[PDB]
Amino acid sequence: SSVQTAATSWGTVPSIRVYTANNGKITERCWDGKGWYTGAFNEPGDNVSVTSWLVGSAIHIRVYASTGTTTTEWCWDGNGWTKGAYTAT
Amino acid sequence: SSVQTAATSWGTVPSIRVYTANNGKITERCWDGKGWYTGAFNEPGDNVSVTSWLVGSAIHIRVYASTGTTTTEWCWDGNGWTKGAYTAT
Amino acid sequence: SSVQTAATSWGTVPSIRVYTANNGKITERCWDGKGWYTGAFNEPGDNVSVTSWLVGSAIHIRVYASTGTTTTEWCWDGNGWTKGAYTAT
Ligand SMILES: CC(=O)N[C@@H]1[C@@H](O[C@@H]2O[C@@H](C)[C@@H](O)[C@@H](O)[C@@H]2O)[C@H](O[C@@H]2O[C@H](CO)[C@H](O)[C@H](O[C@]3(C(=O)O)C[C@H](O)[C@@H](NC(C)=O)[C@H]([C@H](O)[C@H](O)CO)O3)[C@H]2O)[C@@H](CO)O[C@@H]1O
Ligand SMILES: CC(=O)N[C@@H]1[C@@H](O[C@@H]2O[C@@H](C)[C@@H](O)[C@@H](O)[C@@H]2O)[C@H](O[C@@H]2O[C@H](CO)[C@H](O)[C@H](O)[C@H]2O)[C@@H](CO)O[C@@H]1O
Ligand SMILES: CC(=O)N[C@@H]1[C@@H](O[C@@H]2O[C@@H](C)[C@@H](O)[C@@H](O)[C@@H]2O)[C@H](O)[C@@H](CO)O[C@H]1O
Ligand SMILES: C[C@@H]1O[C@@H](O)[C@@H](O)[C@H](O)[C@@H]1O
Ligand SMILES: C[C@@H]1O[C@@H](O)[C@@H](O)[C@H](O)[C@@H]1O
């Protein structure tokens, strides 16, 4: 049908990350002030949400990717993506 | 085809809240630094969005729950979830 | 099944903006501490996400509107809504 997106941003440049769920895959587009590019995030999902927070100026991102009733948390903490501890139960 | 989520976070710990719409009901999973647990929020909806802000250490949360063309705003201001003033028109 | 919403907020009032995709159109409801009102944003879309950031006391808003596989970014920078440079991967 139509794709589904989620977005987050931080600072004042700003940095923006836009996640798109399309045909069962979530990909990431990124803005850091100098043109859009494709990010490192690539995981399966039919639905995506995101949140982020700063510690000082350092960004932490959590992406919630869902297929059917299964949601997986993906974590950015300054050195790549890792699977997080989030569960339903 | 999947559940639909929304997420918010605050502070540096951080705290995180993830809302999931599934089979016409929205439920809440919570992180305050010491493991995921099930939150108090439980209301009807097929779609959810969220935003939040701090007043000191006190979180204020607004959840927008949609069923058909009706969106209800649910408010956390320190003492349970209450309906907010939000309307379509 | 239901309308779909996206929300952002800023400052200490706070100000809130809620975008709703309904029947192929996205509209905007606004809170600046003094009651809900209808905003100027009105554009086509079946799905919506949003983020925002402050530069001094000035809000900047980015709304990601999707129709099929095409996502259009709409930009508020103090002087009306304009189309942004965002493109898909
Ligand atoms: C903090 C920041 O802005 N960092 C960006 C780089 O990353 C992007 O922003 C992150 C916050 C996050 O959203 C991420 O998904 C974004 O991609 C940004 O992109 C990197 O560019 C380099 C080249 O300049 C690489 O392409 C890198 O890709 C890989 C890598 O090859 O190293 C892919 C790999 O799969 C991935 N592995 C994992 C487990 O995550 C790694 C890993 O993320 C990084 O090595 C960790 O540092 O990345 C891109 O991630 C870059 C654009 O030049 O600018 C900032 O550095
Ligand atoms: C301010 C805060 O962090 N409070 C939590 C409690 O509420 C959760 O967080 C708030 C912000 C909101 O998301 C709620 O929906 C969450 O449940 C949290 O749960 C409360 O626990 C008591 C049991 O003593 C009652 O069941 C309430 O109904 C719950 O709201 C507790 C759990 O340890 O942690 C913090 O106090
Ligand atoms: C900065 C601001 O709040 N401007 C208000 C006007 O625009 C509204 O808010 C901006 C950020 C954007 O969301 C617009 O689409 C939205 O209409 C608003 O029209 C006016 C009406 O009272 O009040 C301004 O303060
Ligand atoms: C903030 C926390 O960061 C990591 O430890 C994750 O494993 C948790 O699920 C949570 O996101
Ligand atoms: C923050 C940036 O603002 C404008 O430059 C837009 O054209 C970009 O797409 C981006 O949103």
Ligand SMILES: C[C@@H]1O[C@H](O)[C@@H](O)[C@H](O)[C@@H]1O
């Ligand atoms: C920030 C405001 O809080 C109030 O209590 C609510 O009634 C409004 O709708 C809005 O969410």
